[PDB]
Symmetry: C3
Amino acid sequence: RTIGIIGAPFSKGQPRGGVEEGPTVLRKAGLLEKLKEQECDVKDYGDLPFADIPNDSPFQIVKNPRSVGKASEQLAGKVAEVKKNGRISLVLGGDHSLAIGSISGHARVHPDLGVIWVDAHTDINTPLTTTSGNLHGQPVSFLLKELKGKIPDVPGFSWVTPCISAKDIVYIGLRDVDPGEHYILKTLGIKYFSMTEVDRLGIGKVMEETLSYLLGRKKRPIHLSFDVDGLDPSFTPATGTPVVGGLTYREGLYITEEIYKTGLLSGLDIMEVNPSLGKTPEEVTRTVNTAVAITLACFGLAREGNHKPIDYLN
Amino acid sequence: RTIGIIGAPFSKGQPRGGVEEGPTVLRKAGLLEKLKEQECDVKDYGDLPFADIPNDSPFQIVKNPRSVGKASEQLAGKVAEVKKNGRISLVLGGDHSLAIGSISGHARVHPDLGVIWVDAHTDINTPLTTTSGNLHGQPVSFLLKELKGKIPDVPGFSWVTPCISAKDIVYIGLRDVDPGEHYILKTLGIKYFSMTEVDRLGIGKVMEETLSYLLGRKKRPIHLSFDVDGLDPSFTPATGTPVVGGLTYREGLYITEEIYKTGLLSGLDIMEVNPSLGKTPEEVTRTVNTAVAITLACFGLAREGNHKPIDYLN
Amino acid sequence: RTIGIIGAPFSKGQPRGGVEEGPTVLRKAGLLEKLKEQECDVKDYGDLPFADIPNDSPFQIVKNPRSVGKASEQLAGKVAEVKKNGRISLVLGGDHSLAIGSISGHARVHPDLGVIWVDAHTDINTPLTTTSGNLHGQPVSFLLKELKGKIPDVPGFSWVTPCISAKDIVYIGLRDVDPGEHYILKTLGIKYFSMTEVDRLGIGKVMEETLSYLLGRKKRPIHLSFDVDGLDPSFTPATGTPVVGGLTYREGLYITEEIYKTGLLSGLDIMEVNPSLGKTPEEVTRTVNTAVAITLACFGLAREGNHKPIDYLN
Ligand SMILES: [Mn+2]
Ligand SMILES: [Mn+2]
Ligand SMILES: [Mn+2]
Ligand SMILES: [Mn+2]
Ligand SMILES: [Mn+2]
Ligand SMILES: [Mn+2]
């Protein structure tokens, strides 16, 4: 279970700046070393070098589109590379707009992939339904075959081809969904477990049905796109758009332990960690440490413990 | 789903004073505007003007009885008005002694009502079992037909007629119950889900059985009497009698989302918020914001999202 | 349901010193009085007087063994005394190394006992698998018949005879398990509910299966060994080895309420509370108060309430 680490220091999918240093403080927290400490085969693909696009006026109300466009383009390129090298891509973000490129590149090599999207938001606004203009609240609308016809030609995104259908994604953690997003939800019959459903069924059943929903017809590669604001701000405060009543620390680890155990994790996104928004030094390390813990769980770290197939009573 | 807002600035059901400003900071938090922002039809019935009763010596050990008596009397009057105007009554409290009047007036128009009581306490002490004397720990004993004969004539309450039987109420959130209260519980076979039961079954099953218990024989109006100390002090610290190990934020929203969905909510009480007891400015807004969130959930606000029956892909 | 209180002010099972004042601040928090306030028959057996062993060089990498050895020896003596006096032994700790003596003495009188071990750790390292050397991370390895042959002769422990088999213990709360410990887990087929399992099934089912697992073949005495770091550091911060993602306050009370209700509690350990490690005065009282609450729940205190078999409507 080989990993390809890709740093994605990008922020122009939303207004607040420090999200670009995500790949930096996660790497600083010893992520790749802890992974190696683990069962893991790790190749760092470096931090993608996102060059400035000084001339990038809004498209309608949509902000920084060529910048967001080219950065997902780039990242799409690199993820397909890692996938073609037979490794799980690990995208360190960066705002969630980058999902467009991550899922795009993943599907060029693994078009049958299914998506698990862990988030307080659905990020499925379209350019015409967005009210904020921020592209990190839009990536899913770009990716869905069914929203084909409803995505205008936004500069920076002409390279995009929708690569997943409504039935191939599941949301977990929702609690701040716009009304046009919800319309889209219900209209395309997308499968979701909002905090209501997690409260109702418990994370165990949620994950049962999630995996069953995506793999019951047949095993397929999984892309886990994790926005750390899916977890409660008591666990990941340093993030741009926090919303109270989230997934616990425990629920976050449960989600990823189960995914790990499928053996089918193929692409992972760790997004929206913004150290500059912690209100304290401790809020920063709390958020980083949690994103680290979620990431390690994705690659075999288990709370019941782990050992090698060796005899430990020597 | 039309609402009648009634402010009830009363505190003499217990010792600490600031609970009287509940209707004020909730209104300040933009409650009625958020409701309108929502699907809602809102008529403010004003803040009931509770006049002083300077001559109000204890009855035995029972404190401020004429004051508590007349204020519930008044409120009873006004709730029946709102109900007769075809709207859900929304009582902003105020201490929980006011439940006496709220449920009383509700039942004059809807005698078949069932009660859901969300609270860390059972508030079913009688004047002869109370040890504190505080009437906000007694309202249920006044209301129950079966405790008829065990409620002495307390001044200020001669207008009262018990309007609900033991089988028409359910408790959720209990964790601080006196021994005479528990005797009463078991003796009249009252249905309850204490924190033990919520932990055992989960809030999903709790609400399943609660609704089934009250409506399984036949649909009927519901009175939800919510004491914000039913939720954990980490969520509603600014309250007179906090008790650790409470209902989460999530559980609080779950409870009310399910009630909302019955379509049968008929009377709501939002009680015991006391801004003057927050230990900090933030403890005050945390409590207010939570009571607001619980209140909005009661009237259709859903975490999975909401939209109008319109086509949002225009 | 008669109790024998035994203070065990010992710390040399691990490095940090203040754990020795556990029996002191718990007693200070009014533990025995609250127990008496409860349904309980309480005899204080005093604080065992652990004398210095100045000459106590490591055994290999294992630290303070004669000291740890004699103190468990002593405690073993006293617990058997309390048990032979027909009372539940209540050991106030002290580090968790003392479990060796507590379970040892308990089994001299009740060899058929079953063990519930509530902890973030398995404490089943052997002297040859320990990496730290600290004996409070080893007590289970000493006690298990199946690890017979793999425990070298450590000075201070020659009095020990393994008294429980792999099948007679259940773990609840695990989240920091070494790889040799996990090997042992899987190898001897020990029954455990790690935080993963608690998240998956919920504490209700966990306790169902735990009790069923230990008593389904036949009723037997239960030894509950509770390490307060099994609960989340948000509830018991003043402890030597905290680990995030633990059992809630609620889960902690649920665990013990169910055990209480078996009627079979026979030995209880309340361990690893270290007031000197709270970061604040409040962190100390928070930890103490929680350990108190867990302890009272073990002896009948119920969140739904309690009353005497008397008529309270007089
Ligand atoms: Mn989000
Ligand atoms: Mn997102
Ligand atoms: Mn209460
Ligand atoms: Mn109340
Ligand atoms: Mn431990
Ligand atoms: Mn331990």
